[PDB]
């Protein structure tokens, strides 16, 4: 929800337009998901900030 | 010169500092802001309450 509403600017992209679907952006999504999970319970608040 | 015996066996016991334990990986629930429905002006029915 957060990523799509923000136009994927929260995820970002290196030198590329954000929101594209390819193996590189999927790889970034996977690593970003791991970071969110490791944050624990304050993860939702950190994502909101 | 290289601290070996006459047969070539080493004379000093080495060490390697055993790798530091397994790792814990956790997942968490993530929540986001959610809105509600709105209300419109109502029609006037022909029947009583």
Q: What is the three-class DSSP state of A39?
A: coil
Burial of A1 (0-12, 13-18, 19+ CB in 10 A): exposed
Resolution (A): 3.1
What's the DSSP call for residue A15?
A: S
Cβ–Cβ gap B33/A48 under 8 Å: yes
Cβ atoms B28, A39 nearer than 8 A: yes
Expt. technique: X-ray
Q: Nearest CB to B32: which of A1, A37, A39? A: A1
Q: Which residue of B has its CA nearest to A48?
A: B32
Residues of chain B found within 8 Å of residue A41, distances taken between Cβ atoms: 28
Q: How far is A28 from chain B (nearest CA, A)?
A: 18
* Cα separation, A34 vs A30, whole angstroms: 6
Three-state SS sequence of B1-49: CCCECCCCCECCCCCCCCCCCCCCCCCCCCCCCCCCCCCCCCCCCCCCC
Q: How far is A6 from chain B (nearest CA, A)?
A: 13
How far are the Cα atoms of A17, A38, B14, B18 from residue A42, in angstroms, in the given order? 30, 10, 46, 34
Cβ–Cβ gap A36/B31 under 8 Å: no
Q: What is the three-class DSSP state of B10?
A: strand
Measured in residues, chain B has a length of 49
């Amino acid at each position: 929800s957060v990523l799509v509403i923000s136009g994927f600017a929260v995820l970002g992209a290196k030198n590329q337009p954000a929101g594209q679907h390819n193996i590189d952006t999927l790889f970034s999504l996977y690593r970003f998901h791991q970071w969110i999970n490791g944050l624990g319970n304050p993860g939702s608040d950190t994502l909101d900030m | 010169r290289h601290n070996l015996s006459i047969d070539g066996q080493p004379l000093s016991l080495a060490i390697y500092a055993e790798p530091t334990d397994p790792k814990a990986l956790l997942t968490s629930m993530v929540q986001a802001s959610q809105g509600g429905s709105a209300v419109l002006p109502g029609t006037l029915s022909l029947y009583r309450f």
